[PDB]
Ligand binder design. Structure first.
Ligand SMILES: [Zn+2]
Ligand SMILES: [Zn+2]
Ligand SMILES: [Zn+2]
Ligand SMILES: [Zn+2]
Ligand SMILES: [Zn+2]
Ligand SMILES: [Zn+2]
Ligand SMILES: [Zn+2]
Lengths: 49, 585, 134, 585
């Protein structure tokens, strides 16, 4: 139990790290699409008024 | 997710309990959390026990329980301390170098911005360190201003006079123009659109910008904004080139800018040049003369306030072709002789609060003393120029530091630009004091100016002091000197030609007492820069560190170009000033 | 611009179907249950073929947001359900969330109202606009 | 996915850090990585640790977990070390032979192309590795050419003269036409369509091709292209036949081709045949002979430049029927007396860089010296010619190597065909020098020609040599010999008939000063070939290996067909030169 359980703590830490990496990337993609949509709205509204 | 402030390695840990939540790397954030009281850190998710009805917030008391962070009493049988191995849990654990010295950032983070030592740390710390320090200072100041009471107007006396009631539980802000109110007109739905105001004792006297008719129920507060994170450093790296890069030299000269051109060669050749400009040596002309020196090159006229930018616009109407000028003001009354919101213009005039992100050839940053490291770096954030010019002087008025309680901030540590020109020195100088007579120039030259600013015309013998004592009984945020108020009028009684001298006062409320007894206009010492008059009278009032600082007063004495009156209670400076002291009735 | 046609439908019903003793609601948003919605959509189907086909569709409105005028759908006008009005409309909005950005980037009002006219002779279906030049 | 260079066994590993990323044989790839600094390998998918936020590119540390490749600290428990058994995992590992000695390839791939030893290694090796070395040197020099600063023009002085600035932090290319620039006109959108220019000292002088008006803001770059992987060998296998293969012998003969036909049967008697072509011996007339010696032969006129094919086109408008000629020029002004872009034609005239992939009865390769191993094999890729002729000489000017710094590369080691020309000898020889007199042919024959070239008409005694010392002064990309500039005018005054002679110069900027003093036209030694003049003069300027080594001078001396002037400041060839020596004025 001094070299077996510690070989599962590493796997748990690594999977948690990967999951939070993925969540951060999801948030970043959200930021880019928000910016793109707002600028498309603001550039297409100027042609009509 | 970003790069950490200290180590620049990418990180996902932001100190939650800290004021501005800067990015911190794994070992870096661990050092911060173990060396501060900040025990909340925010990763891509906040580090708190997610189990219902829990309040544990410290990073060391929470362990990785499944897909959440759990404390000792909330964990499942499997667990993992996220505060282990001397490195807090966070992204890029392997790619983390840490910081050998973390005590400086801990001190700046737990800093309460109370004494002078905090500003010493802010100036002495590195680039990102001082940028974060300025951001924290501004955030703390803007949060503190809203922490004061509400200025509810409950009854209307007359024009320029009101009665003001305040919210319970929090104190009252001072009664000067340093802090600007912003009221809103309360309706059945919400409150909106009154304007910026300044209050003073009357009964209270209110100072509004536009015409208004204030009624009952309207209140004013020290409205704050949202301080955005900063990117650029205070100053670009220095680079002395071989020649004047990218600029085409002038064909023929103008005599009044002949001495100005001599200092323009190195400026057009080197990246940035700090300017040692004493009050009124032609600094506004100096920025104007660059356009005469280089008409094609576009110049950005920027200062901390539009009233200071007005000085650049004051000389733009007579010397600069208006068709190529532009003043930028967002949606306050000021100069608008140019076209507003014209980015692609040859000449652009604006204030640090509204200049768009563009590029230019050479910058003119008027009044570098007033702005801190915050606005110092914001110009490099907006605009990266090929050359830079910083109009101002460390031997001038700093900003009013409201949280500065213990100690007075030294002239060098006002900001990054103010530091280096008493270590390496200025790159150009103007010794032509176009206003002050021989009495004032030689006095201020031997004070901080290294006997380097020389007299202009003659010893007018129109500047006087008086070896006086003074008596002060103070109030919430001012001080008044009854004997000195009685001295000035008595001195004006039999020499009436002095009745055109504008009375100066460090505490503007004191002259309001004088303006009732006498009637002559008022001068604010902290805001006397830019304005000047032939005849001005001044009472020194208090000898404390607020009034008789050798350099904070130095602007007031330089207001006069022919003569001044000053009644000195102080002796530290009166023994030095070479003016004439007359009898005491 | 006239889009109501609520009096005309009742006039037609009173002229041709005077003695059909069951309440006919010109707009179905007043209906009591599903069967009444059927019974009124059946009549609106017939009475909507007389009025012009250039008045049906969304009923847009100029809305101010952050000091800028938009054009966003604030209702609809079906042939089979009459006029339906939006309930949560907020003119003079301050800032847009992500939900607002989604519901404003999918509405055809902003798209069509900023495109060139199109007269297509290849089809008999009612064309509206052209988003492009070719 | 192809076969590796050394082993020709199919593989899928590509050397990542290597210049052109060659296909690497698996164990052979392991040898390449362990014996070089190229530690990066890419299969169909790249061999880089795919775990997020990693940096490692060295293959050795990479291990195989599941369907991906992992460094030591990134693996799952199950792994498979790719760097095992001295054999990196890759396609076709067992159908692998490896190479016992790869250090030749290791030095070729780790080559910066600095010394003549680099070209020695490139030329001395075999087909595949020499092709790889040629491609790598081409790509590497093309990479350095754009690594230099940009040629921006900020002021317009006058016609054929400009004021130009350069990018900071990157150096400036030389001041000759050796590297022709290519600027494009910058607009609000992008930069397009100015043209190819050459810049020389004037203030600079631009020598554009077509008429143009260059304004401010237009900047010129050394445009680069993408070198593509060559396939064919530089020379097809040699095979000596028993009869005239594929061609019908001519009926009647021409006296001007009497000396041509005697060497023509052996041209068609074998696959490829080499030439000993001295300057001005009718090599272009030799090439024209095959058309008259075989009317039905479809021959293709090829050379390194359109101006060299122009020489073949020069003799085509006279003897060749214009009804069967075609000049191919890619979409530069040159000869266009034929119809353009006509692959299906008998007589084809094109440069080695633009002729499409066809088949030829017999090829003529003009000026083989400057065509390196790159374009030596380019033609075989386009055409599998039934016969091959190499018009040119190793004892003639090669291409100027901008990367060769130390050591002078041997004349034999230019390419494959010139190498065999010094070992097995040339198959042909033209024994008449149709321009140079006895004073020049006899001297150049004893230099590198094995005394094989004999005089044509007479010893005109119009070629003169002078003994002198001089003091050299050099600039960024030139060197001017002032005493020789004083001498040249001094020599020409006492005989006015000598002013019709053109001035030749190694560093053309030296003659640019001479052209200001005298006004005689200019010549560049490196490109003086193809053009000859009856009266021409020369100044040696420098005795270094750049100018007056034995073979690079042979073109300049052979320019004159009656008499030449050259003042030897050296003594290596002055003693050997059989010219007339006169008194130094
Ligand atoms: Zn903190
Ligand atoms: Zn750090
Ligand atoms: Zn808990
Ligand atoms: Zn109904
Ligand atoms: Zn390699
Ligand atoms: Zn191999
Ligand atoms: Zn890895």
């Amino acid at each position: 139990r001094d070299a077996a359980m510690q070989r599962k703590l590493e796997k748990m830490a690594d999977q948690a790290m990967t999951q939070m990496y993925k969540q951060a990337r999801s948030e970043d993609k959200r930021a880019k699409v928000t910016s793109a949509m707002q600028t498309m709205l603001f550039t297409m509204l100027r042609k009509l008024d | 997710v970003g790069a950490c402030v200290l180590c620049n390695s990418q990180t996902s840990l932001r100190c939650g309990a800290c004021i501005r939540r800067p990015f911190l790397c794994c070992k870096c954030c661990y050092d911060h959390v173990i060396s501060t009281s900040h025990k909340l850190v925010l990763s891509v998710n906040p580090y708190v026990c997610n189990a219902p009805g829990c309040d544990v917030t410290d990073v060391t008391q929470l362990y990785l329980g499944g897909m959440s962070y759990y404390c000792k009493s909330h964990k499942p049988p499997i667990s993992f301390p996220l505060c282990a191995n001397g490195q807090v849990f966070g992204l890029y654990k392997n790619t983390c170098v840490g910081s050998d010295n973390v005590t400086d950032f801990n001190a700046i983070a737990t800093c309460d911005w109370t004494n002078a030592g905090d500003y010493i740390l802010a100036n002495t710390c590195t680039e990102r360190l001082k940028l974060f320090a300025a951001e924290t200072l501004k955030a703390t100041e803007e949060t503190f201003k809203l922490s004061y009471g509400i200025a509810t107007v409950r009854e209307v006396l007359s024009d320029r006079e009101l009665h003001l009631s305040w919210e319970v539980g929090k104190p009252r802000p001072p009664l000067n123009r340093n802090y600007v109110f912003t009221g809103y007109r309360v309706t059945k739905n919400s409150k909106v659109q009154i304007g910026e105001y300044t209050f003073e004792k009357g009964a209270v006297v209110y100072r509004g910008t536009t015409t208004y008719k204030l009624n009952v129920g309207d209140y004013f507060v020290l409205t704050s904004h949202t301080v955005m994170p900063l990117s650029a450093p205070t100053l670009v790296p220095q680079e002395h080139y071989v020649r004047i890069t990218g600029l085409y030299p002038t064909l023929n000269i103008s005599d009044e800018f002949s001495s100005n051109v001599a200092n323009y060669q190195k400026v057009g050749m080197q990246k940035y040049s700090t300017l040692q400009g004493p009050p009124g040596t032609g600094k506004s002309h100096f920025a104007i003369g660059l356009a005469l020196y280089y008409p094609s090159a576009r110049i950005v006229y920027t200062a901390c306030s539009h009233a200071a930018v007005d000085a650049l616009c004051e000389k733009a109407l007579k010397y600069l072709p208006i068709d190529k000028c532009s003043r930028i003001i967002p949606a306050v009354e000021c100069f608008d002789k140019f076209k507003v919101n014209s980015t692609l213009e040859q000449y652009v005039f604006c204030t640090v609060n509204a200049l768009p992100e563009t590029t230019a050839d050479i910058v003119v940053f008027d009044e570098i003393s007033m702005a801190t490291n915050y606005d110092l770096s914001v110009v490099n954030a907006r605009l990266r120029a090929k050359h830079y010019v910083y109009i101002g002087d460390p031997a001038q008025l700093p900003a009013p530091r409201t949280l500065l309680t213990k100690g007075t901030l030294e002239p060098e540590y006002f900001n990054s630009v103010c530091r280096l020109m008493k270590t390496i020195g200025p790159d150009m100088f103007l010794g032509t004091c176009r206003r002050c007579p021989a009495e004032i120039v030689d006095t201020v030259s031997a004070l901080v100016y290294d006997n380097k600013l020389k007299a202009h015309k003659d010893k007018s013998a129109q500047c006087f002091k008086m070896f006086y004592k003074g008596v002060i009984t103070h109030d919430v945020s001012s001080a008044i000197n009854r004997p000195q108020i009685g001295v000035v009028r008595e001195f004006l009684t039999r020499n009436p030609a002095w009745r055109k001298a504008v009375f100066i006062s460090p505490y503007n409320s004191q002259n309001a007492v004088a303006s009732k007894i006498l009637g002559l206009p008022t001068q604010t010492v902290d805001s006397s820069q830019g304005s000047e008059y032939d005849y001005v009278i001044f009472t020194q009032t208090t000898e404390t560190a607020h009034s008789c600082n050798v350099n904070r007063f130095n602007v007031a004495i330089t207001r006069a170009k022919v003569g001044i009156l000053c009644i000195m209670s102080d002796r530290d400076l009166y023994d030095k000033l070479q003016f004439t002291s007359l009898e005491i009735p | 611009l006239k889009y109501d046609f609520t009096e005309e439908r009742l006039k037609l019903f009173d002229r041709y179907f005077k003695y059909w003793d069951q309440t006919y609601h010109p707009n179905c948003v007043n209906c009591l249950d599903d069967r009444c919605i059927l019974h009124c959509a059946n009549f609106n189907v017939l009475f909507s073929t007389v009025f012009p086909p250039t008045s049906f569709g969304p009923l847009v409105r100029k809305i101010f947001v952050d000091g800028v005028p938009f054009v966003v759908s604030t209702g609809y006008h079906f042939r089979e359900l009459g006029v339906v009005h939006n309930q949560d409309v907020n003119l003079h909005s301050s800032r847009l969330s992500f939900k607002e950005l989604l519901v404003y980037a999918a509405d055809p009002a902003m798209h069509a109202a900023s495109g060139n006219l199109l007269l297509d002779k290849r089809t008999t279906c009612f064309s509206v606009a052209a988003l492009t030049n070719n």
